[model samples]
Target: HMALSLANYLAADSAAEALRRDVRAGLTATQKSLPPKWFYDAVGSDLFDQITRLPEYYPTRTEAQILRTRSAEIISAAGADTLVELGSGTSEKTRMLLDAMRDAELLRRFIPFDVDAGVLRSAGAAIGAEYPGIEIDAVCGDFEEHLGKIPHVGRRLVVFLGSTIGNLTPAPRAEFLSTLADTLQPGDSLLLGTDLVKDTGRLVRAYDDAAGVTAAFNRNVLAVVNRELSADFDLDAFEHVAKWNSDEERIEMWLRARTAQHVRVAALDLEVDFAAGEEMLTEVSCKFRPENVVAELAEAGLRQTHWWTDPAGDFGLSLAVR
Candidate 1:
């Protein structure tokens, strides 16, 4: 019941996307899924917060180092009184920026948008209490569909930090940036962080680290299904698999079935039979070079303003302006 309600809320547009999802969910009965977007339930978010701390997961710490070292320049170059953050997760890593920008007097109001209103509520209160000077106007919605929903009336800087853009597939990525570009007025700047491309071995190791946190993160999808769809899935029946798809320039993650089995979705009246050793595409992290990142932004109708990366290009922050 909860999963159905959540899916209905997410696929509010009954016209096409929702219908397609409904048909797929109904027939699959296997509780295929909506998207990884649904993965950030409070527990999942907490797990990801842990993932950031894992020694093998270099992107988070590397990006933090970039922000830690270069935040002053980022604030100065953005020159925006307003700092808008999309997919702001608890504002933990972001506190550094808020503090720096506030100290520099470069930031006035921060607009943070995310689908999880709970996170917004929790993080907003923390930001308010912590940085009394930097005002936060948290916009709680899916930034993909609601970027326009965020008010766009200032010399603003849209901060897409944490290399989260790596979460999107190629097509949705292009569309997402285009949407942001369409919404922003001239002179508004976008600050984007991307995980840099590296050798396949390192990429795969990052996703399949020895600590097994990433595996736990992937398997949590079943728990989400159990809670949402009232589905019975043996969490042990699956394990996490992460691969670096070199041709695609991304790390691919999947939950592979250990044995052939039947899965059910009670609310959707669906059952799906899986072949033994079958795999479901779960997530992707598209690595980027500085040139690729800049070209992508340019294709989205924004030109590179400036960029900052850690000494090793472990992670990067690029500034693009309309």
Candidate 2:
């Protein structure tokens, strides 16, 4: 009943995230839709917060280790006075840099941008509460479509964290990197994190864990659809499936339904029947090798000047400059 309850609460905000989800969910496969970012609804977001806490999920931990170990070195190398981060999420990890740079006096501004305005507002309030001396500006926009919308000042280090770059498919991924370069000047740096290739078994286990928590997290997508769009999607219809794709070098996440069913979208005034046991792709957590990660940067008119990885090479943080 949480789904129905939240729907009732947001019933008045016709332009809220729930309404946007209804609009986008109605798009066809060929209609050029965005990524599954909305899957992290209230329930889904809570699940993803758990996902980060999972022992099998190493990206957050490994990258945090890198930042903790070399925060001062990173702060010095950039020689930038401002830090701009994309997909800022909770902004929990960036605190390492802030603490390390406290005496360095190079961090004059912090710009954290995310598509989720609610979370951005919360992050803004928290950043003010914790680091009151630093200036924090939050922007909400579709990251892929809004690079131009972000204000660019001189000598700024852009933070794109959590291997989010890998979420894009190959060609678009390259193009996005290129766009980041175009957004910055010659000395501007991109501090990015990427998940590295590792044990396939461990990767799959992290996503499709023994505990039903991740499973519930994945299925919450349907519950969100059911609520926001006034659609009836039986959560039991789908099962959570995660697999490692060696050729693609990514762990793909999906929701495979148990049986065929017609899904209705009230906003679009249409219905579509899904095939029995067919899946609607939820997301792709692509793991990159060092060479591929470097190549992605090179193709973007940027050079990878510095890179750091965990002892296991499961996750890496690098500085790319235009």
Candidate 3:
């Protein structure tokens, strides 16, 4: 209720267990990989903030612009009483949506969710200071595992912005979306942000900026492993690689081991060897077309009622309802 208060929940897996499982299983995969979420340590988080500010990064600014201009329309379309945002880091551009809803007298509560507890709290404090009357429910957990914990409130808008949905490949995306769809009752809506297909050169540059911040952000996963698993990975021995996969319609980020090396993870009690020039896929950002977006949402039992994009056409903001 809008009686006004702040609430936070820890609904995901324990930090230590999740880290160990991810490292051991992912590193041992046929094609070595690391899911992007692990790269949110202090260093990784700060580096990502810099990446968004880069001249080459269009997704951040493009998305911000779309929300800045069309938020009122979006809020009107959804008629959300509660704003539940997943991966709500810093809640920077999210202010637009919050303000639009509040100004329309439609917002009673603000719920921000994320896997990073520290940043979640910081965002909660900052947002609280900005919007004093609305209730803030800071949900600290992985959306994949914590959907049940989200409040089934009146006219809810569940947002997964920043094109974070693009981080998953097709099948997994369908599974994630389907899971989310199952949670929605009537009148609930999902606000999704996606990077749309564009020129290959622009996409590639956005990830591999000249300023090298994205490169650092790509490689910070290794530093996370070293700290959390007590692994001795020579940071200098690896280099960041980002490129466009035209066939797959995505941007892939990799960490190439410059030379063969053997490393031991003290926590996992395992030693692993890498081959020279062998690459570990760190992140994948899948770009989508208009049809693909609509079809995907429909397949998950949600119908898209409104689609908003910047005039530049670099990003898409879609609202889907159950």
Candidate 4:
């Protein structure tokens, strides 16, 4: 009989305390902002799921397409026995890689690290049933905090999908890769999914879709803030804004204040003032070129071994080794 294992490394009390501290620090900064990770509470997650399926959102489908078609090549290149996935929500796309590895008789274990315990358990159970021979080790915590805690199991492959890497600014991105570099053994490989540099039309529409799902997704972050911090933010008083910053080669999402007003976060004992039409920076999706991605990965000691992309050239998946 096969046994499934689960570990909870995050405590509710500590997570809440951290949220409170971050909310206070971010909101009081010169440019009011919120960390994008806060947008993934159950409600935000569902909204984001919808956003991905929208016609205008190219990154999700394009990356899925590439993974679906190139699974065998990817598995052959990495030749991994153990797979570690970060932010493994449903891990729908990962099934392709797992199936390829299983078919090739290479799969030994799966280590899925995620913040949401419910999602982690369900995803773990589903994947375990799908691949009965492979061991399932699901760890519940912020991936960044728990990276070192992952038990190594020979020639590993660490995957960070959904272009979540884009959420980090330059310095933090470098720091993240540095931590990842330190966590892996010399022979371990990394598969990174990222959005590519595309035209303004596609890039802007990807973030601000016509269906308004993206808008709802943007506003849900505020809902999280209101609930967690006891903040009095009139959700209706803000509108979602998305724009392309050509100079930065990224798409930016903001919540614009419709009218001048003061908002209070009761728990933090703080009031945030908003000027009319002022935009609060919520998220940035940094698109990358092949040269830039390779250079960035090389800087952190991960040498690029393979790069795969969809036929349309809309998205990219890079495989690197440490």
Candidate 5:
């Protein structure tokens, strides 16, 4: 019989509390900013789905291309019976890795970890249906707090795909990788998807797409804050901007105020003033070079075992083992 179970580690009040903390800290900062993780309400998630399909946004497609071509080799090298996915939204791209493992007769279990319980349940159910014999143990928990709780079924291949690692700034990224390395057993593997540094024009266009879908996505974060925190954020008063930070090898997304205004967050008892043309940072996506990838993984105590890329060299999939 197919088995699909969900373990919720996140307390119901935890998300709201975290949101309150994040918003208060971010809005009060000298340089106002919000974490990109806040950009995923149902509408934002749908906008992101559209972004991935856009011609300008190549990271998703390129990463999937590498997975399509190299998943078998990756599965063979990792020799893992269990697949664990961090930030596993919808578990869409992971089907490739699952298919590879299933074909090799090595997929014993799947653990999809995400903060959204609803998405986790839906994804787990779908995966269970597709892979009838494999165990689907979905974890509704934030990776920052719950990595230690992921059940160890067998040798694991933890996949962090879609260049999601790019979202973390340097310090937290280092901490996350190190913590992950400590969590792995000697034979466990990490399949990391990293977007490679490319032309500045191309990178900028990816975030500031021609169709303006990404712009909508960026503004949707404000909509979320407005709804959740009872904040007054006039979506039309801000313009989306995407810039390439050359020194950091990252793309930064910002929302620039079109006019000076005072805004209030009712829930937080906070008021903020924004000068015309002032920008509030929304997100940063760091691109990586192969050397940087290797060094970072090594610093985390993971040995790089294999590197695969799409033919265009737009994205990279690094297989590292502890």
Candidate 6:
């Protein structure tokens, strides 16, 4: 029998409540902004999948290339029996590391943790079928709230890939890394994927693509709010904007209101006014320097052990230990 099991810790109403809370606070803030987490409803996810394939978007492909060439080195050095993936949507790029671990006869178990139960089950099933003898234990919960609950099975290598850590600003990122460090044992390792800081024009172009797919992806968040909160958002009234903030070393995506308008969110009984040319912040993707990555990991009590970057220097994958 396949050793595959799922543990769900998320309550059914948790997501809706979180969304309502975020909407209430975000839309009312002096600098109106919404967290990027809300952009993953089915339609938004599909739009993002399309964004990853665009010519200007280099992070995904570059990170995958490094993994393809270096997974064996990483697995051998980590010397881990269990792999735990945070935000393990689709678990696609991670198959390379799993393959390397299995080839080395070191892999015994896999844990995929994510908030999306549907994606988690399907990914777990596919992975279990591919690796006949290994265990697949999937956890359905928010990483922020459930990291401590991850099963302690064996010496582990916890992987957080795709530069998702870039979504968090400094303070939250520090707290997250610290919490993750506390979750691991002395022998465990962390494999982090980080997008490196690059030329300003290239960075801006990556977020604001010529094909306009990214623009559509940016606007989809408004559609998400409209559907989930019963808000009437004029998607056409906002123009997508992406700019590089050199001070923060990040790309900021915004929805600029083309004209002043009053909007109402029926569910929240909230009214918002957008002045002409007002820009509501949507997402911030922070790029990192290698030294900053090292410093941040060290601050969280994780030591940097190995660093690999593509020849073009577009992305980096760092292996660290607690």
Off by over 4 Å in 5: 89-92
TM-score (all chains, Cα) for each model: 0.89, 0.88, 0.94, 0.97, 0.98, 0.97
lDDT of model 2 at position 68: 83
lDDT of all predictions, in order shown?
0.76, 0.75, 0.86, 0.87, 0.91, 0.90
lDDT of 2 by residue, 1-322 (tens): 0110000111236436545654466335632222466677778878887888788777777788888888888888888887778865375577877666565877667677766666666666666666656666666666677777676765788988889887888988888888889999878899989888888898899788777778888777677667877777788888888888899998888777699888786755667677787776777888888998888899888899999888878888889898
Instruction: Pull out the clashing pairs in model 4.
Output: none
Ranking by lDDT: 5, 6, 4, 3, 1, 2
Name every residue pair that clashes in candidate 5.
none
Model 2 TM-score, 2 decimals:
0.88
Per-residue alpha-carbon lDDT of candidate 5 for residues 193-278, written as tens digits (9 for 90 to 100): 99999888999999999999999999999999999999999999999999999999999999999999788999999999999999
Worst 10 residues of 6 by lDDT: 87-96
Candidate 4 off by > 4 Å: none
Error of 2 at 180 (Å): 0.8
Candidate 3, residue 211: lDDT = 82
Tell me which residue pairs clash in candidate 2: none
Which stretches in model 2 have alpha-carbon errors above 4 Å?
1-34
Residue pairs with clashing backbones, model 6: none
Q: What does candidate 3's lDDT look like per residue over 149-234, in tens digits? A: 77787779999988899888999899999999998998999999999999999999999999888888887898899988999988
Worst 10 residues of 4 by lDDT: 87-96
Runs in model 3 lying further than 4 Å from the true structure:
1-13
